[PDB]
Design a protein around this ligand. Sequence first.
Ligand SMILES: CCN1CCN(Cc2ccc(NC(=O)c3ccc(C)c(Oc4ccnc5[nH]ccc45)c3)cc2C(F)(F)F)CC1
Length: 293
Amino acid sequence: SLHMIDYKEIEVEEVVGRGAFGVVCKAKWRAKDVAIKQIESESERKAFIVELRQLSRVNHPNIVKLYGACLNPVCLVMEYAEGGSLYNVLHGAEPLPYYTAAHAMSWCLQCSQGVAYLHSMQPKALIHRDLKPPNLLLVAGGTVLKICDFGGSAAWMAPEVFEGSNYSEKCDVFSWGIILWEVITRRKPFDEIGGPAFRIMWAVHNGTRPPLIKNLPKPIESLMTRCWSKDPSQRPSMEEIVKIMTHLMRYFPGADEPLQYPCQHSLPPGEDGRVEPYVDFAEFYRLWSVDHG
Ligand SMILES: CCN1CCN(Cc2ccc(NC(=O)c3ccc(C)c(Oc4ccnc5[nH]ccc45)c3)cc2C(F)(F)F)CC1
């Protein structure tokens, strides 16, 4: 499973942040870039063991990779993802990068691929339960996406979850839908509602959904809204999402192009309950017409 590491071989460089527990630092080990998560209190010891067990089973290109661990002190050593979070790319600090409809779709494809892996694990499936752009890392010039979990999430939370229902892996599907909307519009979902989280939960529980997107292709709108549905059983599985997104990528070439051009990005307030997309689908419609007569 894992490869044990001695803590003296870890050159700790800089602290990245603190999630639910522990602390994440950038570091170097045997002359490779690594991100480490180290324990801080004895209180956290069991939480690490759980996470260490989960990560030792997981091996997928679109999920963060576990190199090894030391047990004194207990510390997880990951392959360092360099490009920062998807949240940062979408909404982070000046200057923001330009990205295409192809990047958007490729990000969401890569996310469905990683979640479908987690949902398919044997003997028991892993559910993410906290899918959102701050938990989605980008690498290789912003072209490759890695799922992770640092441990408010209300804007991406399936209604059955925050209402204390016996939820399933379908909750991840709901989140994926919200993220799809988000990367396409480059807007924060339910940003106008605001206040505390329960105001968003109230809205979504009552059926509120992100506003519809102008000129959005019907095959994409159809997928997106199925994922949003109140009844979990009417949401597609991740495997179906992977399949559909894989087929759709045929009409979205260029996703291997690195993010490099800066972007002065105005957010024109979309009134009348319908917003404009950030990305441009003109090339999709053209490529689609060519194929369909
Ligand atoms: C029901 C609870 N769920 C159960 C299953 N859990 C899965 C689960 C659980 C734990 C994790 N662990 C981490 O991300 C995780 C663990 C350790 C570190 C250092 C970390 O941060 C990085 C790793 C690599 N490069 C980086 N660059 C900057 C920071 C960084 C992330 C990752 C997952 C994932 F979803 F990715 F598979 C998610 C929660």
